[PDB]
Write a protein that binds this ligand. Structure first.
Ligand SMILES: [Cl-]
Ligand SMILES: [Cl-]
Ligand SMILES: [Cl-]
Ligand SMILES: [Cl-]
Ligand SMILES: [Cl-]
Ligand SMILES: [Cl-]
Ligand SMILES: [Zn+2]
Ligand SMILES: [Zn+2]
Ligand SMILES: [Zn+2]
Ligand SMILES: [Zn+2]
Lengths: 352, 352, 352, 352
């Protein structure tokens, strides 16, 4: 089979690999719709998580079950499923500890396009079908469904980690796909004011649609100053770091109230360190908590988000600004995330 | 001054009381809009809180500050305010413990028409204005605003206590005003499926408006059997108890999943005890946590709920089915809560 | 092989059964030390979990692995291991929800002597050896180690659910083995005053040993009255229910502060319902949270408790008043739990 | 009256000041025993929190009330009291938010020797006596009690913020007085393995006494390698940062497991930023939570810590390596904190 792979740092291309076969608990799946992630740009062009050789890319897919192992009980060939970007080995210590994202080591629940051939191939392999796949309700369009495995789970996790109080104020820094789902998640956790930070007009409109009550641009002056101005010097209860550089951490510390929470869902891809401003962190005593977490995955996570879409709590289709037909256009969609045109949020490639 | 009072258990009527004066930290407030609460029906007629003599009733008001003590800093004569039903003494050990609702004793945070002349007078007294009042944006209509002091803080507290997971299923038993804000709160906490329980058509329509995806009627079979058939024997993740008898707890225990949470905000004003079904509570080992709390009050709570209304996260006006004008209709509005018309959710009396 | 079995309700005896064989992920273990649980007495003589036929009793063992399936990686024949009383199926929705104790159904994590042949046999079966077994350090005596599978995890879970604040006052109702571990767990969570409730002299001394500052005996007045007296009317921050009838629930509600928490770890094998006193539960608004959970099991839990024993944070050997040797003494140990004598806390039978 | 004070950055001396008078809620207290804090060293000589002129230093005292305001109810002249280091204004939004340490602003709950004359004078002023004083039981000697206002509440807060799981592993970096209480606190939260990092023999002995099961010295290699060695490369569940420079944060991140928590209580007094290592923090996605908080104060905190001392949960007397008599020796003790002789942990000056 063919797949679109990372050949080595800085290099991508189509390659040929043998079609994968399932273990007793696994599934072979055919992608029906897929999408490229900013994370893969980081890993390919920034070397953000080490070198790789001929690793098929991509980890956002809706698919058709093509075969299952003899122990798989809940899925069968022909079943349409949503595939989480995160597909943990479930029988590990980290799972017993409550962190499947890290089953087998740091970030190891994220297999596709990390330590496993991704979804940009004619077939891909899913470990532990029964624990890691969710059935796709026919009422959910492919384009929207494909926003669930990564964009929705990541953005909503930003809002979960934030431990938002009802009616409290939230700043979401960065309004790309993850940030927009951060705003939406924040809204679904009962935030009052939601201040989005960004400027691409299509992101700004998306942001308002998902619940931002205010939009700040980096031109009306420093973001921190603007937030202080909007809040009369009082700052905000929560900050979700969804994009930008690592100087965003400092901005977040400077913007939040003492006792607030800063939630990072941003995949930082470069730099040796992230910096915490000493003084505004109360010299370590301001109770400004800093969290940062890989999105949840697995079947339960998908079914929960599926329910959120099915019952129309959120509509992730607005994230999808580009849709292409055809296997080969995986590459086109991939290059789209690299040069990132100004009208782009998320591309989806339809394969059926 | 005049005030509408409980003369004694089973008796209400207008009385003449001396106009209250403020200590250095207090404000005197004149109401602009008020509403009656079901809980005052309990105390007046079921002696639910013991005997009382000439206690002015009511604890749901938006008002205007008339005078403030020499130590009051943030409010002055003229300001329009939302008054929480719960107005605690803030210098107590329960406050250091984090439970203002019980400052000075169980439920002691609730003073108005509990241990203090309530808001159905030409004027009323607010202890600690700076800590207990919040400015009312002019953008918010009185009939919506008056839903904040009690109905909203109560319904929402049901959803908070419930510790809702994003996408999880919630049953709300009882769809009166509080129950309806429970449904809204659940949605605002990110609930997927929300199953409301109750019959009154007008409540039913408000329940759908606030987020209910299902409405269960007692008399289509016992509620637990209905919930099971809806959820294919799986049960629900959370139950909020907002109305009905004490048998409601057993129903909750039976329908909620192990590891689930049952959140009560209902006033149970009759019977010696509530019953937990031993077997369905796993004989004590089912991790079915049971919680029950008085609504938060104070300035912060009000300010937070106000932001939710102000940024249109919730529209409380659909709670109001009856609007009266003039100080005299307070009586009519109160008795309306006693006989409970079919078309009634919540009555409001507009004064100026 | 032979095992000591529940022949049917009210009847116990030795039976012959075939030696179990392991699946790919399982282990066959031989007991090196075992102990009887009060829970089994309820099962056999009160039919508290339904009738059973020839079900081997017991679920507290330290053992020697004698056989492992082909997929077992961390355990091999000859390994000395601590076996948790709870051995869940790990690949289930309840696990993904964070509740292994309920994997596959309410309490389904508890297999041994519930839905599965228990440890009172020449051999027994442990499902999922890698997830469910823990290595026993040679430095821990068998009799101490066999308190870990159940007594310590249950008792400590009582303190965990109690969510104890440092320096706060805790009452533990019932000072049998579980309550004594409740006392120890509470001290290890940083409780200040710990008030144990019981009368048996041997349990009384042990309670003191594990950290009780006060021991209350019903012969000195109503427990609630006594707690109110000890706390000069203020009550206590937390109550752990570890023994007594279901009337302990009412006592616990009446003695805890508003905002407090009541943690049940007691197995109520009798009655139709537990009763919550209405008034003292603030008619549902006192923020008096009621929790109740089956103990955690599996490998992580065992390994954490082992560390606590290993580093001398707790000494569970004081739970052990009777040490027998040999399989026959299993029956003697069991019956000892039945007609519980006055010098008895926990009996242990050492097999090699 | 006489006071020992910071004249300006890098300068200390005795000065004469007006004896303060109480407001209606305040008390005037004379010190019976005081201790100096490393924090005052940072503020004076590193100008860590900015310029100051004639600010009486010190915020750790046990004292006798010599006058109260007309509104003070629970304290009278002659009463012996433990005075918390943190004495917040209780009627503020931050208190409503649950963060009294920052009442009126970041760190503002900390008044003595921050933005108010401290306890190193013949008298000092305590705002809101009834909320901020605790009675000293006669059973507690002055030297132990004076460890409560700061050392104990700070070290214990480190363990509380760390959210320790029972039997889990903890590294405490820095074993001066605060770190030693961090060790004790962690043991009182049910920690299993506890690894202390530090070198001074007297601290090493105290660390063992308080619960450290291992002790690491910077001399024997990089701390992170040492910890990876003690833990078979698995790292630890929690890290408490209680001393050292800011490079400690990077150490803590490298040391802790994914899903772990890092709790800072160290008062950093120099440098622009603190660095988080990008890679070891999973590029922002390792779920390695960073916390950092000023110690709780107020009456309740003191009362709970008094219980821990009274009921012999912790014996803070071992922190006191130097006791001097006489008011003038405040200077002696303070200079000890500057010079840090190898046998010093905490000095105490007895004034009665
Ligand atoms: Cl096509
Ligand atoms: Cl006051
Ligand atoms: Cl096998
Ligand atoms: Cl003993
Ligand atoms: Cl060990
Ligand atoms: Cl005051
Ligand atoms: Zn991605
Ligand atoms: Zn009410
Ligand atoms: Zn048992
Ligand atoms: Zn200090």
């Amino acid at each position: 089979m063919k797949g679109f792979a990372m050949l080595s740092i800085g290099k991508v291309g189509w390659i040929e690999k043998e079609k994968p076969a399932p273990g007793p608990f696994d599934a072979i799946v055919r992608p029906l719709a897929v999408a490229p992630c900013t994370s893969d740009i980081h890993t390919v062009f920034e070397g953000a998580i080490g070198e790789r050789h001929n690793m098929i890319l991509g980890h956002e897919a809706v698919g058709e079950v093509v075969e299952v192992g003899s122990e798989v009980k809940d899925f069968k060939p022909g079943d349409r499923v949503v595939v989480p970007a995160i597909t943990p080995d479930w029988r590990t210590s980290e799972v017993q500890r409550g962190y499947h994202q890290h089953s087998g080591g740091m970030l190891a629940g994220w297999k596709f396009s990390n330590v496993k051939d991704g979804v940009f191939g004619e077939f891909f392999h899913v470990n532990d079908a029964d624990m890691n796949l969710a059935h796709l309700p026919k009422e959910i369009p492919l384009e929207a469904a494909v926003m669930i495995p990564d964009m929705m789970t990541t953005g909503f996790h930003g809002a979960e980690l934030a431990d938002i109080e009802m009616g409290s104020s939230v700043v979401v820094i960065g309004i790309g796909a993850v940030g927009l789902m951060g705003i939406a998640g924040a809204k679904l956790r009962g935030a009052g004011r939601i201040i989005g930070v960004g400027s691409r007009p299509i992101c700004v409109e998306a942001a308002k649609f998902y619940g931002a009550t205010d939009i700040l641009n980096y031109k009306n002056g420093h973001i921190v100053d603007q937030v202080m101005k909007l809040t009369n010097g009082k700052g905000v209860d929560r900050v979700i770091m969804a994009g930008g550089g690592s100087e965003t951490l400092s901005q977040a510390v400077k913007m939040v109230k003492p006792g607030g929470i800063i939630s990072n869902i941003n995949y930082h891809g470069s730099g040796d360190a992230l910096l915490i401003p000493r003084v505004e962190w109360g010299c370590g005593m301001a109770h400004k908590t800093i969290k940062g977490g890989l999105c949840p995955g697995g079947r339960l996570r998908m079914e929960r988000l599926i329910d959120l879409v099915f019952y129309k709590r959120v509509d992730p289709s607005k994230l999808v600004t580009h849709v292409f037909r055809g296997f080969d256009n995986i590459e086109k969609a991939f290059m789209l995330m690299k040069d990132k045109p100004k009208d782009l949020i998320k591309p989806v490639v339809i394969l059926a």
